[PDB]
Structures are given as structure tokens and as C-alpha cells.
């Protein structure tokens, strides 16, 4: 077995096409289902699996209430294959309130962290043990991507945040081999504030979508050098922007290079990748709530500011129905690595109050160069029926 | 591992002998099952897997009610090891509402269907993952085999069909090769209608026996010429013919070309096979209703048209039990190839309407060169035991 | 991967030490398990599985009702590695109400009975799919082992019966390579009516202790040459039989040949084995039924007729609690052949009539040379605590 | 596959970051989940597995009442991987009310102990089979040490007990080689009382921290000589004593050679390793019940008697929550060997008696050579939310 390169150009496409989905809450009402939140997927070279974090308990289950919240010493990540709901069997693979994950090409790379908010801990397991942690830097809420880590030639870097959710705060990235955090830099370029970052293989180097939770409703930009370790940052260029809140599309706006200071505060996980002048993105449908999920082209959405003119949208939720959280992850074929995404189908609290609980479902999409019709799928339980 | 090529000679059968049952629902009224239909069973070089089309749910789960509907988003594609009832623990391959599955001797193929009814998007995914997609063509219900497809050589093949259930349609054969559809036939012959074709390998081309539901009560052939991609069609010959609804016996009619056009309207999933000049086959037992199923041999029901002398009957379900849908699987053995089926015996309504779902179980049966008995194997639950 | 040939000498054993344990029915209280009956073991080279015949539904399910009756079509064989209990993903290897399985060394075999009592089909099913059947023969409810069969360099053996159970029958032994018939010995010798034989390999043949359901209490013996396929049949010698009923010790008999003729009606599964003139054999301590189970070292056994010097008892289950069936499998070790035995634990009906269905939890012990102590090792269940 | 050596130096240390969590009694409360007591954590090259003794019931279960009692015959050996809560699924290993594991580079050995009080049986079960066996040699309650066994060059040792459990007992120390015991030496030195070893690796020896039952609340210590079998005992040096009961810091003491006599009767499960001079130890947080869980290394707490100077505290489980017993483990790494402890989280009676069960979750940490925070992560159940 050796090593991930990631050393094949993007694979073309014309949009995405139907991957998975897992019914978590259908089931949930007639069967013993993890409480989950913040799901992800991250495949091997031979085979995906779906990850996402625990609330310590099923849903059916009075430990379900009041699991809206984001941390508990409870919460552990959960990893199956995809496509397989988190049911009684399912492995916790750490304790974590935040985490990421990625595969080296040889062996399973796991950041979990957990523990106080002003003093968190991040273990770094690798191969199924324990190789190294790292304490908060800033003392108030160690966290990070939410979804796959990304590794070449060995070494895999991911990003993680430490401070203010509403202010300038401390981001570093990371550069792990076999666990071993071997270098650590800090942030640098343009963008103000970052969190849970989308990351993705662009060999020779690691590119990353993320969310400016304080003064942009544009997304960060994060690039990744994996020869030196330098970072530069940045904002999309697309006028279409990706958070949400955000403006409406007629006043939207984004020059590349600074936060938009539009609806700037609070945010979502999201992502987008580009190819060449132009950017493949996903967004919730609301402009203001986790609502409806769509994909797009951006037509010189990557290169030119403030860019507007779309083509290729798909529904994947309709506005009628709850999102969440959204994430890239990438896989390799035969000659070119493609782009795929997931989208948290987030039920219960605090949207849905005839229940006390709060968990999520999950529907994936991967890039095709074939083509494709229309449709939506969402999470598709009656709040009405589930146990409350 | 080398490519599948099936070029042993067909196993010489006596008759069917008894393979796998799940008792799904006898099993639902003790336990987290899923909902299904349109189960089928495909083997890979080693052993054998059941799939099935879920409903998103299970079976004791409010959101079973109204599950006879056979197009929704939540409907994914079902994989277990042939006996292993579909449990929570069970992996949900893809979205679907129309399937088929193969395996080439190297990897899986999966052909997943879903979407809006007039736009439809095939999703094929092979070795885990997604290599190609295709819309629909006539926006009218984009759909495929339901059971097994069939590779020879690393090139797989499967049938499809567009358009109108009840009159001239748009079918299609696509030739497959590691999940990249490389290239498309269009139907040619003298079948005028062709639905959820039972194909088996027939060294060196691949056969299919399948659903007219339009004006034959007879069932359509399709051949399919893997060196060339040539497409050839017509009837089987058979006298004694296997669609439900269909005239009885001492009134059917088949002259190997055209629809006989007695009952042809509507239809059921089945199977047949030739060995020579003499013709296996299954069908429901009832000639208007989904109940029962038997098998048997007709004499020159391959080549000599409106043939009707049988033997070696064997009833598999009895006429007072439910059946459904049924097709056929190839499994190789030391010296040859052997023709397998399962039936699919539905529970629920429309035919049962103290409940408000609508599920299945699974009975498979296996070519036998050896000697047997009689019996009858019926989905065996107690439709007053059962949650409504 | 090379054929087990089992050409080791029988390991010297002081008596047996508790090797596995399943508490079906303590979990059935709590938990989706099958209803089960007639379980065994057996291993491949590397590991032991734990079989028995399904009554198609778990226990807290209301089609466990009536389930005291021995053959329905939805019985089927389960098979999970041994100390995992029957729970819903559990695989069903084959349809069965009455079975017997082996593995050669390279693959497992399966014999599995089902259908008419009057016009049964035994289906042979070998690496995992079906090769051969066969069926019944006199009409009377075709039957086998109930325990592992026995392969030698290829050729695995299994008894089978088929006639009266109070009367003479038709028994043969099979000879079977990779599935396929290869030869049927008719029995001979002197036993006069062989059911449920547990067999073992005594290289260079195989030796069965069975079940004579008809006119002796004392068990028959059948020996089976696997190299000309011919047959010997007689009765354990020792005057401490093994049936259930049988006369209390003072005054039971047995002189090697025939049948006692002492309550010699009706049975139980059992087994014994020789080490030189002496016989290790269990059999229930309740004489009159499958009540308690105790196991002991007979001197002269095996050679003298009516011996009834014991050493080396132990119980296994005492005689305030359920037992049932029992058979025999043999693990090999580095240098020499270990014997070990099950004993089925039956609960419910008729014994306990709270209840309205019957199922069986089991408890395993192996050979040993080394020392051990004493205890007692029953279901556990609370009949009061159990769903009816 | 070769044998393990363990010879590779200890991982240098600065404390323990979190590594696994299992929730078992928030999920027993919504599913259907083993109950437990006596848990631990062994690995084989290539993963970790976490073990129990199962009460042969769930906990939402009838059987599950009064489950507090410490041996009954339905007790069975658990064996999962590493955060996998012991479902239905689980596998039972063995029978056992007491128990050992451990891997040997090629095979699982686990060692246990079952029946009567005065005569129990303690099973050596070696790669899948059954290899010896050995019986009670002081009549009292034969029993041994509830984690993981260590393994040098295909050489397995445990530490075994039998007699009284306050005052002099007989402590022997078995080797074993590929399941088969091989040797067994008394325990020699100035330990006087030896229960539950916690032993680990320490090239070209063991290692072992026990419990003292009888006159010590300061924990014995057992080295075994893997070459020629001799063994040696004394006690933890440190002045900080790791028993429970015992007294509090400012009056307790050790001398490295005798038990201390302050509150030395009854205690618990613990461990602590040597790194030169100093130790690392764990222990409950409440000096007279099984209350919190802390860690901390106390400087010349391995080679200086009675040494008081700690440093490097954390916090494992806060002293408002229910602990249990501990136990090491020890998991190579690429060029050390790192320590691992886990904590029984024992809930339920006899501390809280609104339900009628005992059970427990886990939760463990691994040493680390980087930095990390603050947290509790205690068993997490709401007592109240639990069924009785
Ligand atoms: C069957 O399915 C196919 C494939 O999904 C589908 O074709 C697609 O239609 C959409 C919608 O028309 C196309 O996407 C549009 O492209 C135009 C540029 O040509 C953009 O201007 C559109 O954006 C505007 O309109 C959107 C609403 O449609 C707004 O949400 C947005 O804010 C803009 O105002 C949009 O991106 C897409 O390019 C095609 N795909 C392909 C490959 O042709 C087809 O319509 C379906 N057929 C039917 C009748 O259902
Ligand atoms: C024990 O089991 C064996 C094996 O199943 C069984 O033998 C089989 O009997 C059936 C029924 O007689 C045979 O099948 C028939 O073959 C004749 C030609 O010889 C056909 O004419 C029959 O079809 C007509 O009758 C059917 C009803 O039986 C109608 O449904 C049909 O429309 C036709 O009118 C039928 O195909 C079969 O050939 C044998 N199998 C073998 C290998 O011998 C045997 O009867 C069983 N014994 C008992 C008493 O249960
Ligand atoms: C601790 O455990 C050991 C191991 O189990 C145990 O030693 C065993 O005791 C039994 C009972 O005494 C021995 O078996 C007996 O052997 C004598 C011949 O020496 C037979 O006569 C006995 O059979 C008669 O008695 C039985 C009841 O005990 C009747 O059921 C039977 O019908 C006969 O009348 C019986 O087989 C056995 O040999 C030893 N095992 C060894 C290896 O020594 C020991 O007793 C236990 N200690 C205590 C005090 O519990
Ligand atoms: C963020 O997390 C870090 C890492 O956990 C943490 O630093 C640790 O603080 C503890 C507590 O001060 C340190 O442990 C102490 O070490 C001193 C010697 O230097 C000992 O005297 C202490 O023992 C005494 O006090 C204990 C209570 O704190 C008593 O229980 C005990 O009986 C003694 O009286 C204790 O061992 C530890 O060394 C550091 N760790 C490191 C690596 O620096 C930090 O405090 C956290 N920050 C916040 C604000 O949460
Ligand atoms: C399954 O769903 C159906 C449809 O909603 C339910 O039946 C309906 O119940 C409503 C409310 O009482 C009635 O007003 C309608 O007349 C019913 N519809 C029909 C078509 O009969 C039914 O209750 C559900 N089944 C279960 C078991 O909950
Ligand atoms: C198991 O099935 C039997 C047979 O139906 C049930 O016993 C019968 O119950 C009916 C209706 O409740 C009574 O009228 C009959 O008197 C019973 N028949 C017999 C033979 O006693 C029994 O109730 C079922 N058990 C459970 C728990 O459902
Ligand atoms: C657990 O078992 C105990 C003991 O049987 C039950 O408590 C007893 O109940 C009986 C009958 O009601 C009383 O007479 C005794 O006084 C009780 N014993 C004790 C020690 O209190 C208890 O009900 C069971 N728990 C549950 C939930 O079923
Ligand atoms: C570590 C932590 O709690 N991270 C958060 C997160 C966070 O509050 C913001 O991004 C602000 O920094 O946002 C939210 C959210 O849904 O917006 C979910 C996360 N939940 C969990 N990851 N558990
Ligand atoms: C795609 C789809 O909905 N196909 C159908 C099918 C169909 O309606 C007819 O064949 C007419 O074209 O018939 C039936 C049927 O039970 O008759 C089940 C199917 N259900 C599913 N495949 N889900
Ligand atoms: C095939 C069949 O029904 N065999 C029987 C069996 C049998 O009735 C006698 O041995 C007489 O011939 O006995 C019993 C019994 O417990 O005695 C269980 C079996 N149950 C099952 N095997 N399913
Ligand atoms: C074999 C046995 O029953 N051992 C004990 C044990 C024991 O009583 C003492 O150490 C004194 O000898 O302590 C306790 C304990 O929680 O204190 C749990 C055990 N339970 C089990 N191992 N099952
Ligand atoms: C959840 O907890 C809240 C707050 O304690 C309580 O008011 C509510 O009743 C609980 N919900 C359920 C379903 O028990
Ligand atoms: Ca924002
Ligand atoms: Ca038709
Ligand atoms: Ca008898
Ligand atoms: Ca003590």
C-alpha cells in the first residue's frame, strides 16, 4: 500500500449526480438510531464511509432531550460505511465534539477533540492509536473542519481555529505524519476569520472553502503549500455568495479580498471548488435559514470579482425542506479525482419544537461528466410521527 | 482477480431445489426491518447477496403507511448477504427507485435510479464509486431491470427503458465498461414493449426475458450481441405463457414474434430460460392476481410456437399465498452455469388492507441436476399479528 | 488451503472445561432473538459457529406461538461465529428443518431438508452454492443429523434416514465432494434405527453414537470406511446407557449388538466416543426426561458389554433445570484431535406452559487434559420474566 | 506474523489525552445493550478491542435485576472492537466470572474462570480452541486479574489468586505458550495480598500494579522474569496511594515493602507505571468510595518511600461522578511503547438504588507526548431517564 498523491487533474463534470442517502430519522422512529450532528464523509482508496458526531445516546431515548447543544463530554465520532445509518453497532472511533478525518493511502488519520471550552484537548489517532494531542491555544473553543483532513505524500494538514466566534481569532495549520504533528503554521493572507473549512487535494498543494463567522457572508479562501508550509488566504470571487446569512443575489457582493461586511455574522459549513476562471458551489436555498440546498456553476466564479452569471443549477433540497451543514470531499478515479459533496439534513430543535431533540440525515452527490435530470431529496420524516 | 466470461457450458436441470428464505415479515413483527420491493439476488465469484428497493423505512414505523407507492426519494438500494434479513445494520448501496446490480469478476456495478418522474438521473457506480450518470430520455419514467445485470469480459450490459407503460416506449441496451457507459443501443426486433428484463449470460451474448405491458400476455425476448452491440427481439414461443394478467391456458397464445394481445395491458416482473429446444420458466400460479407461483418445463417452448405440453412442475408457492415479482441469477460452477430465481412474495396491500403498508419477503430456488421433492414456502406471516 | 484429512491421534483427555455459552433466552427477554431449536457446532480450521434451525421469528413476536412443532417452511439454518447469539443479523444459510454442516478444510458444506413430510428435498450446498439434491426416498419424513458432518481428504460424510420413527426405516450414508453426490452406502450391521447421529472423525474413517428411536435405549453405533465406502453398524456396550427415556442405572442393559428393548421408544440426540476400551459419553441426568445433563468416562465402555464402572463424572446442567439435544464436534489441535460437546437448553413448551412457544439457549465444553472443577451451567432464564 | 517483544523503550509521557468512550448505559436506556461490570482493553498489532463480563442480560430486561452479585454461570466474556457498546451483536468469547486476554503477535489467549465457589475452572482458550484448563488450588474463589495479560516472545503470563479475600491467600503466576501452560511459580517477595493485576510490558520483563485486599490501601507490585520464571513483589513507593479505601494524603503512607495498614481491607482495581524514579498513577478521587478519577505523576514516586510531590494532575472523571475500576494496557508504537489506562463508570446499585441493576460504560485515555487541556468525562446517564 502507498501513499495518496491526489497527482491527477479534476475530473471534468457537468454537475453531480445521486450518491447516497441514509434516512437517519425515518428510521429513527421505528428502530434504535444514533442522535447525531455535523456528519461528514471521507472515503479510502477502495471505499467510502460516513461519519458524524454522536450525542452520547438513540433517539428514541429521553437522553435524546435537549441535545440542540454543541458540547458534551458525551459526543464521539461515529464511522460506518456509507450508506449504513448509525444503528447500535456502529464504532465510536474518539471522543469529540469537533473533528476531522482522512485517509493517507495506507492508514486512517483521526482528529478528535474534546473537553472544557476554555481548555480542550486534540488527539491526533492514527492507524488505530493514539500518536499525539495538542492543547487550546487561546483558550476558548479549540475547533475544526467538520470534514475530511487531506493528505499527500504522507503528510496530511488540516485546519483548526481557537478564539472569538465573533471577532478576529487564532487560526493554524496543521501538518501531521502518521499522527505526528511534525509543523504548525500560522494563518496568513487576507481572510479575517475562518472556520470549519471544506479542504481539498489541488496536488501539489491542499485548497480550502470555508466559513468567516463574523464580518463575511462571502467564504474564506485557505491555500495550502504541503512543500513549504506557507498559507495564503483569500475570499471567492463570486458575487453569488456561499454563507448563509447573506444578501439576496441582486446585492450580494465579493472583491476576493475582504469580508463583505453583508449579513457578515454567524454562518454555515459549506464549500466550493474551483475550475479554472470558474467555481462549482453549493448554498442552502434561504438566504437566511438553513433551508433548500442548490449547486451551481459560477461563471468566472473563481477569477472575477463580484461574478454573477450562473448555469448548470441543480435542487438537491427543495426550499420546503431543512438543510444544514455542507461539505466537499474528493476521490479518485481511474485517470482524475473527482469532487463530491454531502449536505446535513438537520431535524428537531431549534426549527421543530413538537420534539426536544436535535439530529440529522444525510444525502450525498457526487461530480459526473455524464448528465442528469432533477429532483430533491430531503431528510423525509414526518415531524409528527417521530417520538418526541 | 480476472474478468467474469461465463463460457461454460448451461447446467443441465431436473428441476429447482430450495436455496435461501428471509421471512422478512414474519420478522417485522419482532424486530427493526426494513420496508422493501422489488428484491433481486446477484453473486459475486465467491457468494451470494439479496437486494432490495427500501422505503426509506421499517416496517413497525409509522412512516410505513402509504408505502405502495413506488417512486419516492427515500427509496435506496438494499444489500446484504443472500439470508441476512435487511436489519438496521444493513448498507444502503444508493438512492433508488429502480435498480440493477452486477457483478464483472472484478468489482460491483450499481445502476441506481431516482429523481422526478419526467427527469429522471441514472446514477453507475462501480467499485465504490460514482463513474457515470445518464438523464432521461423520454421523460416519462426512466427505468430498468430489477434484478441482475450481466458482464462478459469486463463489459456489462443492462436494459432500459423511457416512456409510456402503456404503449410504444423508448427502450435501450448500455454497454458498461468499469461504470463508464461506453456505448448505446436502441431496441430492434419484433418485441414491442420491454420492461424489467431477467437477463442471463449466454456465452457468448447475453439473453433476456422480460415484461410487456402493453399489449402482451406473452413475454418478450431480448438478445444482445456483446462483440457487435447488436440488438435482436421477439417473443417466447411458448404457448403456455408467463405474464400476470394473461388468458388461461386452454386460450393462450404465442407465435415466438408478437404480442398475443390477450390481457396484454399491465403486467408482473418474471423470467424464463431455453435449454435447446425446451423452455424453463416460473409464473405466478393465479392467471389475474399475484398469488402463488409454480415452475415448470415446456416441451419445444423455445422453438416451436404456441407450445403447451409441460412437466417437471414444482410449486414453490401455493395459489392461497401471496407472490409478486421474480427473476433470474446466473452462478458459476465447476463445470457450469447454473440458473437460480427468487420470487418475491408481497405482503400488505392493495391486497391486504388491515395494514397500511406494503412490504416483501424473499423465497430462492437454484437449478438442480439431482432429484426432489414438493412443498410450498409462502411469506408465512399472520397478517393479523402484524403491526398496522 | 489443503482438505482436512484429520490424521491426528485423539487427544487424552481427564474430562471437559467449559468452552462457550450463548444465554439466548435471558436475551430474548430484552431483545430481538430467533426462536431456535436443535442447535450444534461446528469449526472451520480457524474458528468455531454456532448453528441451529430458525423457527422463522424471534421470540417477543406473536408468531413465536405454537412454535413446539418441528417443521414449517420458514425454519431455516442459522449460523453465526459460536458466542454470538442469534440476533437479527444473523445470516440463514439455507432452508432447513433438519440440516447438518461441515467444513473440508477448503469450504463449508450444508445438507439442508425441507418441504412434505411425505416428499421432502435435501439440497447440498457447498461454498456457498448449491451442487446437488436429493429426494425422499421412503416417503416418511426425510431426516439427518442435527450436528456437524465429517469430511476426509474431500469426501464428507452424512447419515440420513428416511420411514417410520417407531419401526424399521430406510437409513443411508452420502458420500459427498465439493456438493455433489458421489456414492450412497445403504447402512448395515446391526443397529436396527438410526436418527440424529453425531459423528466424528476417527481416522482413517468416521465413527456416529446415534439416536435408535424405536426398541433400544442403549445407543447404536454406525461406522462408515471412507475408503470403500462400506458400513458397520452396532450398540455402545456400555450397561450405562445414553437415551432418554432408558431404565434407571440398576437396571439398564446393553450387549454391544441389539437393541435393549428396555423404554426404548421415543429418544433424545446424544453422543459418546471411544478411547480404547473405554467410552466418554453425556447424556441427561433424568432418566425418564431432557432434564439435567451430566457427562462421565465409563471403563471398558467402548469394549465390555454392560459395563457400568464410571469415573470422571460432571454435570454439566443439573437436574433442577431444561436440557435437550447433544451432539459431539471435533476441533483439531497441534498434535491431536479434541473432542467437544453442546447441549441444547430448551424452554417453553411443553415443559413450561406459561408460555406458548419454545426456543433453546446453548452451553459448549471442550476436552481437556488439564484439571477443572465443578458447577452448573443452565439457561438462566426466568420463565416469569419472559414474554408469553 | 511474529511474536510480540514489546522491546522497544517507553514512551516518554507528559500526561494522557482522550482516546475512546463507549456511553453503554445513556444508550441501555434507548436500546438493547449488555450489562456489565470488570471491563478492559486489550489490542492486537493492528487494533484495539474493549472487553467485559456480561451478567448474560441486557439492561432494559427483567434479568437484569439484581445483577450486583459477582458470579453467576451466565456470565460470559464480551469482546468488541474498541467503541463498539456491546450489542446484541457482541460476540461471547467465553464463560467466564472472571477474566484475562491478551494477543501474542499470532493469537488471542484468553484466560477464564467459571463455577462453583469452592471449585471453579479456569478455560486457556488460544486461537479459537480450547488448549487447557486448570482447577481451583486453595477451594476459594479461584480468580485473576480483569485486563490484559502480556505476552513476550510467545510467552504468555497472568497472575492468578485463589483463597481467602482478607488475609493470606495463594498467588500463582502462570506461563503460557500458545495456549498450553507451560510453568507456574508461586509468588515470591513481600507483597502480601494480590488481586487484579494491572500488568504491563517491560523489556525483557513484566510488569504488574495489584491490589491489595487484605492489610494495604498503598498497591502491591509484581515482577515476573520471563527467562527463568522467578518472580518478585513489594509495593508502590509513593506516599500518594493508589487503593480505595485509604486514608487522605496528609496521613498516608509507603514504605515500599509492606502493606500499610491504613484502612487496608477491601479496595479496588488500579494501575500505575515506573518512568525511572518517578510513577504514574491513577486512582479514584474520593479516598473511601469508587468516586471521580484522577491521574497524576508523583516525582520519585517509584524509588523513593513515601514520596508526596505530584505534578502533571488531571482530572479523568470529576468526584460528582461515578468511577469503578482501572486497568492499563500497552499499545506499540513506531519507536515506543505507550501506556494506555481505562475507568469503569459503574452505575446503578449498590450507590444508586432507583433501579435494580449494575452495569457500567467506559471511558480511556493514552499516554502522549504532546500538550492538552481540561474536561471530565464521567459515565453521562441520567439515572432518572433510565428503566429500572
Ligand atoms: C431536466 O433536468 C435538466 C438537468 O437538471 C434540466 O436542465 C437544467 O436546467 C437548469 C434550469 O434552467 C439550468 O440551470 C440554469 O442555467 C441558466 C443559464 O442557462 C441560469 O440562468 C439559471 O440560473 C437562473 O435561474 C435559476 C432558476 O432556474 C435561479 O435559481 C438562478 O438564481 C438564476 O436566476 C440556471 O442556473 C441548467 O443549466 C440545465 N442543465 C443542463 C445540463 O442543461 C432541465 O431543465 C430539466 N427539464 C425539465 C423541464 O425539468
Ligand atoms: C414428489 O415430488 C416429485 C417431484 O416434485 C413429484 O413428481 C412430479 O410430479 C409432477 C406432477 O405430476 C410432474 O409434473 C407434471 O408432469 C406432467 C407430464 O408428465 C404434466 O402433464 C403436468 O402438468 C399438468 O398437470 C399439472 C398439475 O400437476 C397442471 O398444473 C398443468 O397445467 C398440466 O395440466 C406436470 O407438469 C413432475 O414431472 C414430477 N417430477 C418428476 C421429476 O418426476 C411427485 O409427484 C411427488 N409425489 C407426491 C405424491 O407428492
Ligand atoms: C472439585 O471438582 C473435581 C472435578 O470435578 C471433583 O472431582 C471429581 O469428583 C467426582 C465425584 O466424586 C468423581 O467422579 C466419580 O468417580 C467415582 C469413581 O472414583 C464414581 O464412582 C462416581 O460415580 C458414582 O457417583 C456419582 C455421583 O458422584 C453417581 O452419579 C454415579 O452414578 C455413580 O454412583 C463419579 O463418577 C471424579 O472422578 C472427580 N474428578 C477428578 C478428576 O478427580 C471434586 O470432587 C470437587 N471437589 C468438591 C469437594 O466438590
Ligand atoms: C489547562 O490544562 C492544563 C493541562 O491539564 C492545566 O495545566 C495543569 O494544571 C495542573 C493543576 O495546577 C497541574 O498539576 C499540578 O501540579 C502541581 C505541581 O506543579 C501540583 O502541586 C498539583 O497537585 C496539587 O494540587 C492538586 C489540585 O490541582 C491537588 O489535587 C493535589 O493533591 C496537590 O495538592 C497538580 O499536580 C499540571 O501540572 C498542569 N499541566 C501542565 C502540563 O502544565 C491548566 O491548569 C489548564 N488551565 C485551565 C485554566 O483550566
Ligand atoms: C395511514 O395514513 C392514513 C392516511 O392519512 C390514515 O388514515 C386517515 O386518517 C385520517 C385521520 O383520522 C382520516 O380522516 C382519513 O379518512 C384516513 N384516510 C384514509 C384514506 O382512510 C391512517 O390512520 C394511517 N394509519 C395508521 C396506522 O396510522
Ligand atoms: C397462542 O395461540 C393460541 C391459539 O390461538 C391462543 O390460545 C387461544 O386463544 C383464543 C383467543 O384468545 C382462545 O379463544 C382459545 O381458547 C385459545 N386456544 C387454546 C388452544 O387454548 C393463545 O392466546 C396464543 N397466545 C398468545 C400469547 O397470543
Ligand atoms: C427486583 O427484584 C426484587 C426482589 O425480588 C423485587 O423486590 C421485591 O419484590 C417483592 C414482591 O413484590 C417484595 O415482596 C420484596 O420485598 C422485594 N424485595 C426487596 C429486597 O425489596 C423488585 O420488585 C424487582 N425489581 C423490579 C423493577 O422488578
Ligand atoms: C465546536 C463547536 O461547538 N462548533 C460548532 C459551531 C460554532 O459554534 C461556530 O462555528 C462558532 O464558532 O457552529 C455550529 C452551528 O451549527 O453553527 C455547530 C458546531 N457544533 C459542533 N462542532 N459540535
Ligand atoms: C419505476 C417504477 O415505478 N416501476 C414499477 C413498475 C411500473 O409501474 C410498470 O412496470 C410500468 O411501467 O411496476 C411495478 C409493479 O409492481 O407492477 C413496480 C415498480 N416499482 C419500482 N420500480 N419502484
Ligand atoms: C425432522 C424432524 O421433525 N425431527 C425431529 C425429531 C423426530 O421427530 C424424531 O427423531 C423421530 O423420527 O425429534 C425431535 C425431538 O425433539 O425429539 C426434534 C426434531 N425436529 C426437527 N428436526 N426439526
Ligand atoms: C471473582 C470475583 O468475584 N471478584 C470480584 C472481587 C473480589 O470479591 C475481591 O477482589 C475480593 O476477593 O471484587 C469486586 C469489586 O467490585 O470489588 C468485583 C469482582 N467481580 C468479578 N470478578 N466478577
Ligand atoms: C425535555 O426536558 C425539558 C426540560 O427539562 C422538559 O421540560 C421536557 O418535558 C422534556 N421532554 C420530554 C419529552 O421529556
Ligand atoms: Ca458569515
Ligand atoms: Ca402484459
Ligand atoms: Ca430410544
Ligand atoms: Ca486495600
Known amino acids: 500500500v502507498e501513499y495518496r498523491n491526489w497527482s491527477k487533474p479534476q475530473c471534468?463534470?457537468?454537475?453531480?449526480?445521486?450518491?447516497?442517502?441514509?434516512?437517519?430519522?425515518?428510521?429513527?422512529?421505528?428502530?434504535?438510531?444514533?442522535?447525531?450532528?455535523?456528519?461528514?464523509?471521507?472515503?479510502?482508496?477502495?471505499?467510502?464511509?460516513?461519519?458524524?458526531?454522536?450525542?452520547?445516546?438513540?433517539?428514541?431515548?429521553?437522553?435524546?432531550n435537549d441535545t440542540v447543544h454543541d458540547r458534551i463530554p458525551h459526543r464521539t465520532l461515529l464511522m460506518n460505511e456509507l450508506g449504513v445509518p448509525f444503528?447500535?453497532?456502529?464504532?465510536?472511533?474518539?471522543?469529540?465534539?469537533?473533528?476531522?478525518?482522512?485517509?493517507?493511502?495506507?492508514?486512517?488519520?483521526?482528529?478528535?477533540?474534546?473537553?472544557?471550552?476554555?481548555?480542550?484537548?486534540?488527539?491526533?489517532?492514527?492507524?488505530?492509536?493514539?500518536?499525539?494531542?495538542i492543547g487550546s491555544w487561546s483558550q476558548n473553543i479549540l475547533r475544526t473542519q467538520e470534514s475530511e483532513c487531506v493528505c499527500i505524500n504522507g503528510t496530511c494538514t488540516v485546519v483548526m481555529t481557537d478564539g472569538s466566534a465573533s471577532g478576529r481569532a487564532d487560526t493554524r495549520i496543521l501538518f501531521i505524519e502518521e499522527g505526528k504533528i511534525v509543523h504548525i503554521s500560522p494563518?496568513?493572507?487576507?481572510?479575517?476569520?475562518?472556520?470549519?473549512?471544506?479542504?481539498?487535494?489541488?496536488?501539489?498543494?491542499?485548497?480550502?472553502?470555508?466559513?468567516?463567522?463574523?464580518?463575511?457572508?462571502?467564504?474564506?479562501?485557505?491555500?495550502?503549500?504541503?512543500?513549504?508550509?506557507?498559507?495564503?488566504?483569500?475570499?471567492?470571487?463570486?458575487?453569488?455568495?456561499?454563507?448563509?446569512?447573506?444578501?439576496?443575489?441582486?446585492?450580494?457582493?465579493?472583491?476576493?479580498?475582504?469580508?463583505?461586511?453583508?449579513?457578515?455574522?454567524?454562518?454555515?459549513?459549506?464549500?466550493?471548488?474551483?475550475?479554472?476562471?470558474?467555481?462549482?458551489?453549493?448554498?442552502?436555498?434561504?438566504?437566511?435559514?438553513?433551508?433548500?440546498?442548490?449547486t451551481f456553476k459560477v461563471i468566472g466564479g473563481w477569477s472575477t470579482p463580484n461574478s454573477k452569471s450562473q448555469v448548470n443549477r441543480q435542487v438537491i433540497v427543495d426550499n420546503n425542506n431543512w438543510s444544514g451543514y455542507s461539505g466537499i470531499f474528493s476521490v479518485e478515479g481511474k485517470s482524475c479525482i473527482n469532487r463530491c459533496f454531502y449536505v446535513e439534513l438537520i431535524r428537531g430543535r431549534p426549527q421543530e419544537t413538537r420534539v426536544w431533540w436535535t439530529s440529522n440525515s444525510i444525502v450525498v452527490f457526487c461530480g459526473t461528466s455524464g448528465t442528469y435530470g432533477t429532483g430533491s431529496w430531503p431528510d423525509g420524516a414526518n415531524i409528527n410521527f417521530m417520538p418526541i
Not at 447525531?36 to 450525542?55: H, I, M, N, W
Open 87 to 133: 444503528h447500535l453497532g456502529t464504532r465510536q472511533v474518539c471522543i469529540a465534539w469537533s473533528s476531522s478525518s482522512c485517509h493517507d493511502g495506507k492508514a486512517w488519520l483521526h482528529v478528535c477533540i474534546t473537553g472544557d471550552d476554555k481548555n480542550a484537548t486534540a488527539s491526533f489517532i492514527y492507524d488505530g492509536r493514539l500518536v499525539d494531542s
Open 187 to 294: 494563518l496568513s493572507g487576507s481572510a479575517q476569520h475562518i472556520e470549519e473549512c471544506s479542504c481539498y487535494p489541488r496536488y501539489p498543494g491542499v485548497r480550502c472553502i470555508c466559513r468567516d463567522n463574523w464580518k463575511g457572508s462571502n467564504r474564506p479562501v485557505v491555500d495550502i503549500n504541503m512543500e513549504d508550509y506557507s498559507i495564503d488566504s483569500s475570499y471567492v470571487c463570486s458575487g453569488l455568495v456561499g454563507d448563509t446569512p447573506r444578501n439576496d443575489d441582486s446585492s450580494s457582493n465579493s472583491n476576493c479580498r475582504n469580508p463583505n461586511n453583508e449579513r457578515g455574522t454567524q454562518g454555515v459549513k459549506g464549500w466550493a471548488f474551483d475550475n479554472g476562471n470558474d467555481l462549482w458551489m453549493g448554498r442552502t436555498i434561504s438566504k437566511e435559514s438553513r433551508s433548500g440546498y442548490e
Open 12 to 64: 471534468q463534470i457537468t454537475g453531480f449526480a445521486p450518491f447516497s442517502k441514509d434516512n437517519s430519522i425515518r428510521l429513527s422512529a421505528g428502530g434504535d438510531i444514533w442522535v447525531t450532528r455535523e456528519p461528514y464523509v471521507s472515503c479510502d482508496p477502495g471505499k467510502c464511509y460516513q461519519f458524524a458526531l454522536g450525542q452520547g445516546t438513540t433517539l428514541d431515548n429521553k437522553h435524546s
